Amino acid sequence: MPIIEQVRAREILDSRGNPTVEVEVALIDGTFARAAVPSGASTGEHEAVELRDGGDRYGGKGVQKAVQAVLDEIGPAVIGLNADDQRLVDQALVDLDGTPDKSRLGGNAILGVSLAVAKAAADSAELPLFRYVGGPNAHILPVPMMNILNGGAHADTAVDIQEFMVAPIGAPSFVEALRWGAEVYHALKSVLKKEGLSTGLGDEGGFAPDVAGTTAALDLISRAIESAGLRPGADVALALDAAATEFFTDGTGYVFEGTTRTADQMTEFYAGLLGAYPLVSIEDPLSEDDWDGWAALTASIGDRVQIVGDDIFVTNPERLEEGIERGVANALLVKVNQIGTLTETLDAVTLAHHGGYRTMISHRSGETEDTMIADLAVAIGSGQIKTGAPARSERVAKYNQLLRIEEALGDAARYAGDLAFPR
Amino acid sequence: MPIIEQVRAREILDSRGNPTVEVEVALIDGTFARAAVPSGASTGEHEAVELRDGGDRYGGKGVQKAVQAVLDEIGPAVIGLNADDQRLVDQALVDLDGTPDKSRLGGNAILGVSLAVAKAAADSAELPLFRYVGGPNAHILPVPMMNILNGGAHADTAVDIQEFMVAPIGAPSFVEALRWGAEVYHALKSVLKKEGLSTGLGDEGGFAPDVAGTTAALDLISRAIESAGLRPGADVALALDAAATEFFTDGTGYVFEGTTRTADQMTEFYAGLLGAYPLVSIEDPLSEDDWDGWAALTASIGDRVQIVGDDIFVTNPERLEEGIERGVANALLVKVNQIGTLTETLDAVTLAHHGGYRTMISHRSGETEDTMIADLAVAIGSGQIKTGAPARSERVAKYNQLLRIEEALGDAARYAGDLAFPR
Amino acid sequence: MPIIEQVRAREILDSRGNPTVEVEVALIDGTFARAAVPSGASTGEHEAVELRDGGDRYGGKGVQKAVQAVLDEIGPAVIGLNADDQRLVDQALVDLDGTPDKSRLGGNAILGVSLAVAKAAADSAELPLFRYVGGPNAHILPVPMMNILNGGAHADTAVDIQEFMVAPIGAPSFVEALRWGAEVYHALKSVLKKEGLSTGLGDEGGFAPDVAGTTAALDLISRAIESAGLRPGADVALALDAAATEFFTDGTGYVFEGTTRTADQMTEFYAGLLGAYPLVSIEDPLSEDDWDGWAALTASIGDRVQIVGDDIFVTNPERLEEGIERGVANALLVKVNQIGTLTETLDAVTLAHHGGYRTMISHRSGETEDTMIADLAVAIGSGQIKTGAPARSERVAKYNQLLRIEEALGDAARYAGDLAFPR
Amino acid sequence: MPIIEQVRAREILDSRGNPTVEVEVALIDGTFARAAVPSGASTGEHEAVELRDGGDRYGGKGVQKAVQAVLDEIGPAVIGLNADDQRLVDQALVDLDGTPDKSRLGGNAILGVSLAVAKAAADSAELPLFRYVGGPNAHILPVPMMNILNGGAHADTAVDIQEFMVAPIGAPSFVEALRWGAEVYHALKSVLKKEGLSTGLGDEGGFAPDVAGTTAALDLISRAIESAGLRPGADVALALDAAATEFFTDGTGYVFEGTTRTADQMTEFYAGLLGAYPLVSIEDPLSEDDWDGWAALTASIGDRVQIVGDDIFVTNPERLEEGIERGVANALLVKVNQIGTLTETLDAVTLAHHGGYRTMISHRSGETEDTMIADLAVAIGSGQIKTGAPARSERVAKYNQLLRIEEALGDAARYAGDLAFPR
């Protein structure tokens, strides 16, 4: 029977050296799962909050309090519920907390118990996690968007765009897409030296070069794609993560390249980009409060490229409906710990699917060796995933799990290449 | 293990007294599931065809050779595959047939094996058939659309619309919706008798009264809703199945009630109805091939009411993509035996979900005691179902299974009442 | 072991849209059963009464009270008893009620538990339900008496005979008997349309057209048997359900065809019928209390035809003995919910077998998808069954179960054709 | 599963010191049953034939041939069939033999395999043999007819009535009936010992002293009933086994008491006996070929007493129907080894039940420690049994098994006292 028997959390380190929670939900059979909770650099005004300790131990980022919360309250508050009733246990937790942010118990503890009971309600039925969460029709492997060149708010250099990404949309299978991504990565690693630059990896495995400007960055990436042995656009596309809030001074314009600009000027810059490069997707092109500018930019360049809402929505359905109404952001970005539980992620991704919006399962800055977002991007059939460059094995664990998923499917699997970027 | 061991097939009678196929896929453990294949009154030009015997036995509708196809070819052609691989087994069947409409082996000998395999890839995992096919987030109970008054191509009457339906959209739960539907049904049964009419049940349990004109029928239905104790629009809505192909003389026009009309006139009729009555959905309003007329009518009234494509699309993805891009019919009916497999069913419903189209799991004229379409309407989360009037227990078995589903969910269940008809 | 662990009831809809009880009796060794209780409208004075709610819900036909009788009282009153002791559990229930007609707990809340434990005292021994109740020698498949024409108290028509039935007594097996019945039923659907009559199905799937007198109806049936490809008498016989109580005015006489008659006149009408048509059985020829007229009728025609007591007995043994004494009809209908338990059913059928009376398992007006009476008609070896026309799959589910039974027996099965009607 | 795996046969001694066959059937599911075949001396022309060895070993009564027939031919001919399919295996045996008497393989070997298969099927279902062979409604305990006074063809005495039996019809339960029978037996033993008469037990444990005549014998029995403390007729009744064939010279007449007389005078003697004594049953009152005399006697006294056909029928259905039609012998005597299988036994007892005839499971002269006929008399619900006096533990094993059956039933059991002898 899939009824929870024990729950116990411990405190571990994430990929950045900061503590995080790890929950281990056992079942009355012997099914013993384990799920670690990722954590972002910060938190806006609408996400679920992490319950950090605060003080001097671990730089004020200890999670002994969330561990204690799991071990004292969340433990017996679910022991005895039905594992396969994800909508039972998740509402149980959300009411046990009682706040709109899960502040009393922290989003990290709630999410840890949610994910571990899901991994036990998939281990129980002997299904694999992607098959359980997605059913029988879970067969699509996503297009990996590999952030190879970092800039903007990361390396404090002359670049303003945050993440430059490549996407092997032309591959025949997923394993060839992973090969092409790794080859473009290792080609850029040498183009940097052949242009006198540095090879210091950021937090996603991407590079931190001191290149002139945005256009120079895209040109460097295109040179690396050509040097790999591929054809830009037909084999490998490009993508952007503008992260506009990092350079938008409220009351003034966006400060880009050393000039103050309006939303119209940024839209003109994006149109000039869409011109000379095979861009398929831009993420957070304007600030998360400039709804009118977002509608303007969506109407202007929203038929030729994907528009991802990373900050303007925080995987909250209540803001997603509003953004659907005003005609902004034809794509969502699903981060599992910005909403706090599996069920709410599934509901938000449903709501964004039935509105004409593509979704994209995404990673956090501090990840672990947990490979659940791979299974989750296969299950919901998003056809896109954003989980870093092929380096820093907290990013590569996801790609390895997707390889195993494809191998386990076999003839059933399908690579979602070029069916995920019609524009 | 979920590996098929033994497959059998026999010939049984459907709800109308015609033969049909019943398959019994067995697993190595002992999992033993049976599934009967429904069948429509006629097989069109894009469906999968049924492999009838032909001749003089059973009026030429015997299925003794679709029973033989399962026992001589399909049995060993699937024995040994993996149950949880719906994609695998369904592609195996589709290639073993080798035709664009499954004619060599019949679109009934294959669907039986598909379904009875899915009823064991869910019986094995000990999940219930609705939790398997839809995952963990399968919680939405659909709005029953009850066909209480039949007309048009069903009986000799001056009525031109095929099926008049009621929909209890204002109920708090599903069980109260079923109660309201049954009460409206009995109220109408009393009203017809009190107004000197007949109570002869059709093939769906709906009535065949000798009333004059469409408007009088909607008025009778509103009077029955009032007499039941409810209020139209706030508690119970209305719906239509025009089935207008049944009176469109090609090159002449939609001749009905003694008036030859163009596509424009039918739109005016529908606008008047939508104004004077609380309609929420009209099904097949114009014709199977009048694409331009469909685009016109969708532009005219296609945002104040639901437009269901029953015949213009045949649950075929290839025609569905065309109807999407041409902007017609923001809804479709999902009849499982017009496509041939469970897999292609899920694929078409996905393709129509991601296009802004609501779906509606529907029944056939000849059904059986098989209650699979209930489990399937709650798994895909359609939020609508069309399975006849609360009579003729081949139609009530579905409602009983939905009651059991709602009871098995518990507090997790949600009734999709009023959140399926925004217009 | 076969010891009852849980019992739980719910409220579902029957084939006519009225509520009924559905009980589920789990055992310790898994063995989860369910059994729905049928319910007929025409309740007399000696049967067990149904515990309806009364009020405004469901038109006063709710059964929320009988669902409580099972969940609060009947549940623990049997939890712990032995399943294979039908006598034990059924006497337990009959004493726990304490009334001569089970009125305190309802003759529907009790029969559900009886039938469900009998379905678990066979699912336990892994025997099939027909083999358990009848032992090792349960091998006889019954002749189906298919009701194809409805008249009398059913529709506005000049006929006073209630049900006109055909019986394929000349078939080699049961499958061919079902085929011949379905073919006659589909032939009559044309002979009606080929004479300007209506095809509105009643409550048993039989037609309710406007014909002139009994003789014209029997002639239509003979024409349909001829048009099917068979020959009357040698292949298909005839049967009658004279519901003569429906036209007997106490103290005035049987008003038949518009001419007041006495018992002698009705006997003369029956004797004239026995000449021109191959009738094999008539049920309820005169009335419930007209004992003297019956003993006078079972002597004039009681040698050349079967006389079935449908209302003169209500499956009550106490009435059945006194009927055996007075030289009254030589057959009875076994309706399981007019007596209240399986045990008393078996006892009454035993008492009527040894008296030289043939039996006939029969259906109710409101049935469900429960196919128990098929197993019961095979087990007791009645050699006759009356379960409606081959339509309305609440009636066809029984025939499908009899087909499954016949192929599960194998070479052991025997069709009781023409050995059930010696006269 | 209930599929036969091994069949063995050995040669043992019966209660009289003659060899007989014992068959042991081992199922594939561990079940291991053992059954021994009784054998009587007096064999007519229609019973099954016992396959004896013939020669000088064991006086020509060896059964090594039947043992070898089971071990070489029947074993593999049934190994693999389904236990619960009694009719399957029994038709298999009857065709494997190929003769109308089973003489090629002997009725004893076939019956041994049949009975051991039934015992293993009952042991498999975990039901006890009476519950299996009778179903759920097997609850009636039979009235033991105890043969206490032997005469006629058994010893040198002036009596022509073969068996004098007492029947405790007035007991409240079965255990009190057995007590009353044993007490009457010991009282008669004392009454005989007082009169210097012989106390040498026959083959049934009953005495055979040199009494004057039939009337003196019945008077001695009545004295013994009075001396026990009971009331003749109200507590204990009487019964006869005349076996008139043992004193009917064909063409001369029944030489009774030393006065040759016709059937009419024998009927007069029986009428006088019935008048002056509480006789409830007479067995074989006339010869087994004098059908007309039997009809005369049945008309004369055949409603004031039970007329048991022991030799006029040999448990053969084909002779039973002929005796039914001519109005003779309103009772049957079921000996299991005169027909050859359990299936044909059940069929003949059914045929005699549905004709107004009571049945009576009976024993043979050479019995064994096998107590199967007790279970069989409970299962078929005969309400009578004839298995000797309470002595000679091959007769008492049956009564002990009936005690255990009653104890296992418990509150469900019913003693068929005084309900089995209306007249």
Residue numbers in the entry:
A (entry chain C), B (entry chain B), C (entry chain A), D (entry chain H): 1 to 423
The authors write:
The octameric fraction was further used for structural studies. The structure of enolase in the apo state was determined using both cryoEM and X-ray crystallography. Freezing of apo–MtEno and PEP–MtEno at 3.5 mg ml−1 was accomplished with glow discharged Quantifoil holey carbon grids (R 0.6/1, Au 300 mesh) and a Vitrobot Mark IV set at 100% humidity and 16°C, with blotting for 3.5 s. Both the apo and the PEP–enolase data were collected in the Titan Krios at the National CryoEM facility, Bangalore, with a Falcon 3 detector in counting mode at 1.07 Å pixel−1 sampling with images exposed for 60 s, with a total accumulated dose of ∼27.70 e− Å−2 and dose fractionated into 25 frames, with each frame having a dose of ∼1.1 e− Å−2. Particles were extracted with a box size of 320 pixels and subjected to two rounds of 2D classification followed by 3D auto-refinement, per particle CTF refinement, B-factor weighting with Bayesian polishing and refinement, and subsequent 3D classification in RELION-3.0 with D4 symmetry imposed. The nominal resolutions of apo–MtEno and PEP–MtEno were 3.1 and 3.2 Å respectively.
Enolase, a ubiquitous enzyme, catalyzes the reversible conversion of 2-phospho­glycerate (2PG) to phospho­enolpyruvate (PEP) in the glycolytic pathway of organisms of all three domains of life. Here we present structural snapshots of Mycobacterium tuberculosis (Mtb) enolase in apo, PEP-bound and two 2PG-bound forms as it catalyzes the conversion of PEP to 2PG. MtEno has a topology similar to other enolase structures, a smaller N-terminal domain and a larger C-terminal domain. The crystal and the cryoEM structures (enzyme in solution, frozen) along with the biochemical studies clearly demonstrate that the functional unit of MtEno is an octamer.
